[PDB]
From a paper:
To test for formation of Dha-containing species 9, the −18-Da protein product was subjected to reaction with a thiol, a reaction used in protein engineering to introduce covalent modifications. No reaction was observed on incubation of unmodified [name]-10 with β-mercaptoethanol (BME, 1,000 equiv.), as monitored by SPE-MS. By contrast, after complete modification of [name]-10 to give the −18-Da species (8 h with excess tazobactam; validated by SPE-MS) and subsequent addition of BME (1,000 equiv.), ∼80% of the −18-Da protein was converted to a +60-Da species (relative to unmodified [name]-10) within 2 h. This observation is in agreement with the addition of BME to Dha 9 to give 2-hydroxyethyl-cysteine (Dha-BME, 17). The extent of conversion to the +60-Da species 17 was increased to ≥98% by simultaneous incubation of [name]-10 with tazobactam (100 equiv.) and BME (1,000 equiv.) for 12 h and was decreased by prolonged incubation with tazobactam prior to BME addition. With [name]-10 treated simultaneously with tazobactam and BME, a +60-Da modification (in agreement with Dha-BME 17) was observed at Ser67. Samples of [name]-10, treated with tazobactam or tazobactam in combination with BME (with full conversion to the respective −18- and +60-Da species verified by SPE-MS) were crystallized. Notably, although generation of small amounts of the L(2R)-epimer cannot be ruled out, the addition of BME to Dha 9 appears stereoselective with only the D(2S)-residue being observed. In both chains the hydroxyethyl oxygen is oriented so that the OH is positioned in the same location as the deacylating water in the active site of unmodified [name]-10. The different stereoselectivities observed for intermolecular (BME) and intramolecular (Lys) additions to Dha 9 are of interest from the perspective of use of Dha in protein engineering.
pmcβ-Lactamases are a major mechanism of resistance to the clinically vital β-lactam antibiotics, with >2,000 different β-lactamases reported (1). β-Lactamases are grouped into classes A, C, and D, which employ a nucleophilic serine in catalysis (serine β-lactamases, SBLs), and class B, which employ metal ions in catalysis (2). Penam sulfones, which are structurally related to penicillins, inhibit clinically important serine β-lactamases (SBLs) by forming transiently stable covalent complexes, thereby protecting β-lactam antibiotics from hydrolysis. Oxidation of penams to their sulfone state promotes bifurcation of their reaction with SBLs at the acyl–enzyme stage to give transiently inactivating species that are more resistant to hydrolysis than the nascent AEC 2, turning penam sulfones into transient inactivators of SBLs. Studies on the mechanism of the new SBLi enmetazobactam employing mass spectrometry and X-ray crystallography inform on its mode of action and also lead to reevaluation of mechanisms of current clinically important SBLi.
Numbering used by the authors:
A (entry chain A): 19 to 264
B (entry chain B): 19 to 265
The structure:
Amino acid sequence: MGSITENTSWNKEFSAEAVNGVFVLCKSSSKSCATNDLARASKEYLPASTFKIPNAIIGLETGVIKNEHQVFKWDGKPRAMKQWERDLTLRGAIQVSAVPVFQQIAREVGEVRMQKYLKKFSYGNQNISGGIDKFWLEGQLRISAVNQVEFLESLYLNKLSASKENQLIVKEALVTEAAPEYLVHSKTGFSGVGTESNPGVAWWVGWVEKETEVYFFAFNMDIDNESKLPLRKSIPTKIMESEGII
Amino acid sequence: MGSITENTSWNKEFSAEAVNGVFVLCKSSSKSCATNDLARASKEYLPASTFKIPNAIIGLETGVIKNEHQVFKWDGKPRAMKQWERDLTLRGAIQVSAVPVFQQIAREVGEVRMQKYLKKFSYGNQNISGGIDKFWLEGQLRISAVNQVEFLESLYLNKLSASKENQLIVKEALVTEAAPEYLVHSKTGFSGVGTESNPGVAWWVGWVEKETEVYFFAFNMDIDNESKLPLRKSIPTKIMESEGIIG
Ligand code: NA
Ligand code: NA
């Protein structure tokens, strides 16, 4: 989504760190969202690691991922991070953001089915061109913070074009904080440090269930140095703590 | 389960707190369980609050609970705990162990259906005598720690006689700790202090998903003073920490 309203009270959390970015926070639904930056809220960026959310759903829907207990075996050959050099469950691969596991899922899904599902999901600009195993890493796919919270709301409500079972499976894999009072589902992304005069993007997207309320959120920021990466969680966390949500 | 073995390594965690209790810990991959006390692992106790797990599944299966987004509204009449005096989701009602919500679920399920599902689930002695809204807390229902882990393994595998959807809904409601390397699902129970002569029971049951391994656990202890209640989590947590599973 409905209106997007600007909230100036969050800018201090960005300025304190010299961060150029956006937070979008929607209470109850995407009908009413708040943001620090109206223009950037709808600006589209490479999804990077946040693409594992639709990719997992599509993997399950197509049967490429058999069910939530499938183990993705490591073939013993070098992977870019040591934490990826092991057998992984679906939740495990999401939580350590094991790119090679999801590259193989994408290859098996294939371009025709991938395009079909991103159209169904209204996922960003739906541009998968240039390489089926890297379009979300270095390709032309782009999605905004507002679109992320619309997509996550659909997932929360089990309203994506997928079985409820498969949406529930992916939601369980995204739980990142549990307390009696609230539950956080979320996913990070980081495209890289970019190139000269062209920074990369870092993301944190998800939702919070607190009492009988739900809050959808999406954060992104420009980033050209990996030492800044934790700000993708700390800035939105500080905003949501000051709102009383977590 | 495939096998069970008694292990003395864990007794020190009980003796340090002067607790009479049992821990059962089962590793899925090896189909192997260990316990500090084989006799007590087979003893059957009131499930108390741990019964919210089957009760939630049954409520969903029967349609008494619509789905995971149903809100259980507070009517404004005082409840035994201020923390229950509010609208609650299914997860919320499970996490604060809101007795009156699940009493009403049980009433709507009814005796005939409740009996049928506890038979399907092989849940304890399947005796629901004592009142449809109290049999798990003050009635004749009894379940052992071994039976709890058998039941929880079936839930984890979506092998209970319920839709996978409803098993998944209840599993999400049971998540109590999330870390990048492991996920804990769990539920507490407490029957009361009983007497000095005949103490109550306190429970902590659940499972841990770590790497590709899954550990099913059930803890219970005698309890005659509510000040000891935190031990139902701290003793099994210290044991699972010393095995390298959590923390
Ligand atoms: Na790799
Ligand atoms: Na981070």
